[PDB]
Design a protein around this ligand. Structure first.
Ligand SMILES: CN1CCN(c2ccc(C(=O)O)cc2)CC1
Ligand SMILES: CN1CCN(c2ccc(C(=O)O)cc2)CC1
Ligand SMILES: CN1CCN(c2ccc(C(=O)O)cc2)CC1
Lengths: 291, 291, 291, 291, 291, 291
């Protein structure tokens, strides 16, 4: 990449300046999942980008999922699943496995990758110092809300204690599990939890890494793809969208309505997508603002 | 326990005062393992004791093992073991399982138990913010030192960052895994790691919970049991001792020689053994001091 | 006290934990007087208990009286008293003697006793750094309110400066004298002053050491003795009570109504009564809460 | 004092500037005794001068004696004295009286006077928070050193804790009593104690208020009076001097040799002598420097 | 000045005490101009007085003008002026000259004079760290408001950042220039700017050095001179006053109405006028208070 | 610059990461002069680059010259010069002009440019709070060292006070003038002063903006141009070099020998040269390291 003239290398760096100003000293919550989590070069680029933010004096917070890895581990352990609708029931046994995979495996790899750049990453869950709690969630199947075991939503968040972590120069890598009011640990959808953390921390931005170019309003019409949309318009289009886009959009809606200036659906398939979305106007993502 | 006269209840509390003075504001590293970790009433008493220390303004640090749980998980996963001497070889696969069980299961339960008393516990490993590193260890089998994979000793310790944690009112619950100088995570014997943490943190005391009354010099002679011994005398008796007492004694030796005022082999089978050993002179344990 | 099984010694210590949690980092104001002040073993136990609180990270504040010692000194000096009702008139001369005995004798002994356990105690009065002021009080004799010289009530309190003292790890030992708005030092009833300090400091508890088992509602009916009562019910019973119980009850009323969660009338004749009342449910005292 | 031209009032103020520079943020220990302590207008001027120092951001520390007041109180109490040489033996009884008069009477008046200008003064002794200790002293009578009871010299000083007091904006008013290594409180000559405090605190100046114009080398030759002298020359002249000048000179010697830049023997009979000696070159005192 | 008795030197110093108390830790804004700025002995006395305030723990802030020096420099550079009414039009060229003379010459001399007493003075303008902004002002000539170029009023003030400067022990020496909302630097009348800084900083006093004894209500009637007046009465007399007294009075009005306890018109022709006005009741100035 | 593929824009940003890590929290002293100071687009790019560093949590310090502007002002004022060798003699008059142009004109423009991006820049000289001093320098003409008036070298530097400035988030813009030990302000060569500031502040890098591609060892041989060289080799080549390269090389030598890890001669004619040199390996400059 050095057959590229050095005066255009200058221009791309200098063009980052207004976004460096906007984010210096600010929290950015990054939902990390999908292919940016399974391909090794995307993974290493994601970790380097978190170190980038940290070495600009920005405060990244990383929230991660791990759906497929849990399924794989349960199959290896021969744990037979129960399914209501399209949902696995989270028995105490499935939770133990989920937590052990999310916190003891998926979070650990990301911590080590990030820490290749310095002593930055620290892994946590709602359980650690009671950072946050969960409330049991029901899901709606075939019209009826119903119980699927120990799954929840983020209840309340120790905002102060988390902000201390990032001001110390740490990158929290959050595994979405947390105790309920009775001390019973639930598993939390990582997309929703990221929106809840973003709003509780007064984040400047929420980034949602997904495996798509961005939100299409009439998928698969190629020119239905938007680069920016407001909460009011996004709320109306949501019952139109594909199954897997629902949680990423609901999280954005909730976050931006909760006061987070903007939320972003960006393409995790692009190397250094974080860098592209934050420090460049050539972003493929779609930006959600209030309106 | 109230058929007991209230003026003797006074005397037992008042008799704790000199040990409260000696430990106020001081670090105490507690190696936690054995039966105090599998029986639920001993477990709940261990957690309540950590909260006790914390609510006296003492700084407990908890180091935990989990040998049998790892074995059980490997069998469930059908992972065939390789054995040199009496040692399982820690392949990258066994390490992934070990870390996932130690940090994602065993540490999590203790964090939640402790946190039933308040937002105190926080789980970590050498990986988090590069708190400590490992160096690969060899073991000696049938006379010859030899490789058994990704097992190590604690190399160096970010003393400052850990002391910050405890001064914030947190109880670190340490799972003994850490990266080597190249970022490759090793598993560390929990007994040795506790001694290394104790010495690096300038701990006032190291407590080693084991399943025995204390050190017997001529096991099983009932009256060979000691209540106190010095490093010089303990060093000489060590090649005499039982297989499983070796690591607990080596850790004490190393810790006390490293400047930790005293190390204690106490009986994990006793409810609230920590409270008994620290705040009472009726301790069953054996105290190791330098000499 | 070691013919007592060590597993019951554990249980009494472990039973203190919820009261350690409730009082960690909290102010406790202790009115100290009566026999707990004249018998040497009770005195030494009172001082050791203050060191106990301090070495649990609790913030004890000690308020003391000294009625009889003042009388004795005035007789030694041949100072003839004037009496209205049952009250000595506090001339400037009597105040000089009172202050010199309270601050220069009674407070000093307690400071030295406490300091046998460490550099904790510090003696003060309203005069020092203008910590608190007094307003002249009148008393009612035979129906008529009337002047008895330089006696007062605590007027206002430098809450901030006192809290600094205890956060520095100090135990203030307060002699109840303070200047009025014109700089004229008055003597203050120690019971009332303790209630005023408790309320001004946001104390968690006020303990009143007196020479009785507790409040009897129909003295001397043995089974009129209560262990808990509310302000509304206590207010109604007050004109029924014995002469010397009035100030201890009024102080409790005022304190608990002022927002102090509970006030306690405990028996100063019991060694380590403080320890018994705070860290044990076998307390002989009576607890006052709002209602 | 306003028949004085306003442009000469300017000049006297402006002439204080170099001494304000030299003492800003510095400790000045002031031994206060003699007539500056018994005449009310001198007393009020002494207190106003301490407030002056404090309101220039200077850190005054006041050490006081009280010999005659102790004698008067002992006579009032009919306490028969024992005398070796010219020294009263300090029995435990005499100490109780001494402490009660120094701390409970003499110190209190000065605290209240100073506090007429603000919440500045705070009274203390070696006993409070173990600020300093004493070691038993013997005196030499008719050639032989001998015991005179509970009299001592300042042993060691909690330099840090005292400096905290003055940085908080407080004026410590010290009564010279302190515990020995066994907790037994001794009385300390106020002149010597002031020198010891000055040296322990790194004071910039020690001022010794005495009832004389200054040191005369050949008393009563009017022109033997000096305004400045060095430790070497002062040490040689000391066995020549009057009985009561010995302690004031020994204190200066010890202080200046201990590293205190200068010590000053100034006339307590002059209103606002402190102000004259510190902020004016027309001082009557004598300055001691090292040489 | 030493043919003056030393006991009257005491009295003048001691008479400063209540003004030291009133100003300790307080901001005093000093408009410095006129003859106190051109005569070298008045200048050196002004600088020594700023050091005096600083070495009493007072926080002086110095605002300075420099009208005549700008005129002289423009003539030296042959810059032809344009005049509307009696006002020079401030072209970009005149501003460059003004700023370069005010900040690069007049402010520098005062900084160096003050710094002869220590590392205190620091020169600044609205431009530095955006300490304050300007808004373009129009003037009224022959009845009509009209533009005279890049002249303004102080718009808003970074109160926090300035208070940090003085708490660090610095003396800001302010040259009255500042950017408007678009970054265009304007020149500001120093009298008005001093009033604006005084009000923004919560100053205790504003002193206005001018070349007159004080405000005369019927100049030149010798006994129309006042020593104190309120804002309501001063506002009514203002359209009566001389041309050059208008800005000094308007600044006082605005400041005292803005909450500054008092503003003072004092005679810059008097050596150490600052010292006389602040620490003496023989001040020639006139004090403005609200009413 | 958006006809450039967005995945190469990513790569240039991501390639800055190791230099962000190396400079986060570090001082970088930037000598700013030449054409990067007279062309408006280079100037605006220089200011934006200083804001860039600041919004990465880097601590830029800007040192500036202004030779030609001083000459122009002296000619406008008709100040006749005296010349020894090729040096103007700096009379007190020339110094007044120099300081007024450097601090009151050249520094002010840069402060305002930088401040277009935020409240960052602050202008200073050695005079402000005595930040640094000068010692009079002589120059050597035709073999003989000789006096050229009030020109000097940086003597000593208040390292602490400057580091406070940058930690507050400020960009100091230094005009190289400072008082000597007697308070007499001298003018200092900006190249040398930048090296002295770099060494006194423990700077990570010194950048020297000059109008050349870099150091040529055999100018004008096109392929004598180096990209890196050590102090030992650079010292030997220095008497070979062009007149104007001498000060830029001497400054580098002194700085790197003084412990500054590297000094850089970079081309001020390139837009955003700072960004290119720090965050890119395509730098045209030459790096000086010790050897
Ligand atoms: C010492 N390192 C590792 C742990 N880090 C944590 C982890 C968790 C928490 C918490 O949940 O409160 C705080 C610090 C701090 C830096
Ligand atoms: C230095 N020790 C002794 C005095 N202590 C006091 C005493 C009184 C006050 C006050 O009344 O403000 C503060 C500290 C602090 C610790
Ligand atoms: C380091 N010295 C010189 C500069 N001083 C300043 C100057 C300006 C500012 C500002 O305008 O923010 C702060 C400190 C601080 C002390």
């Amino acid at each position: 990449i050095e057959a590229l003239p050095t005066h255009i290398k200058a221009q791309v760096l200098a063009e980052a300046l207004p976004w460096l100003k906007q984010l210096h000293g600010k929290v950015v919550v990054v939902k990390y999942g999908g292919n940016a989590m399974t391909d090794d070069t995307l993974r290493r680029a994601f970790a380097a980008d978190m170190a980038f933010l940290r070495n600009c004096g920005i405060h990244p917070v990383v929230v991660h999922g791990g759906g497929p890895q849990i399924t794989a581990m349960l199959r290896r352990l021969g744990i037979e699943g129960d399914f209501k609708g399209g949902f696995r029931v989270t028995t105490p046994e499935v939770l133990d496995v989920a937590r052990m995979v999310l916190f003891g495996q998926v979070g650990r790899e990301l911590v080590n990758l990030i820490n290749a750049h310095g002593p930055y990453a620290v892994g946590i869950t709602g359980e650690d110092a009671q950072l946050f709690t969960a409330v049991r969630r029901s899901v709606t199947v075939d019209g009826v809300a119903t119980d699927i075991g120990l799954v929840g939503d983020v209840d309340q968040v120790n905002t102060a204690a988390m902000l201390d972590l990032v001001a110390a120069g740490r990158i929290p890598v959050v595994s979405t599990l947390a105790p309920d009011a009775d001390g019973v640990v639930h598993n939390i959808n990582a997309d929703t939890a990221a929106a809840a953390v973003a709003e509780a921390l007064g984040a400047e931005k929420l980034l949602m890494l997904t495996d798509i170019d961005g939100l299409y309003t009439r998928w698969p019409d190629r020119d239905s793809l938007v680069s920016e949309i407001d909460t009011g318009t996004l709320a109306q289009l949501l019952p139109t969208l594909e199954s897997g886009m629902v949680p990423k959009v609901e999280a954005c809606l909730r976050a931006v309505i909760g006061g987070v200036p903007s939320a972003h659906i960006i393409d995790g398939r692009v190397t250094h997508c974080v860098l592209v979305e934050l420090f460049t106007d050539a972003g493929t993502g779609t930006k959600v603002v209030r309106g």
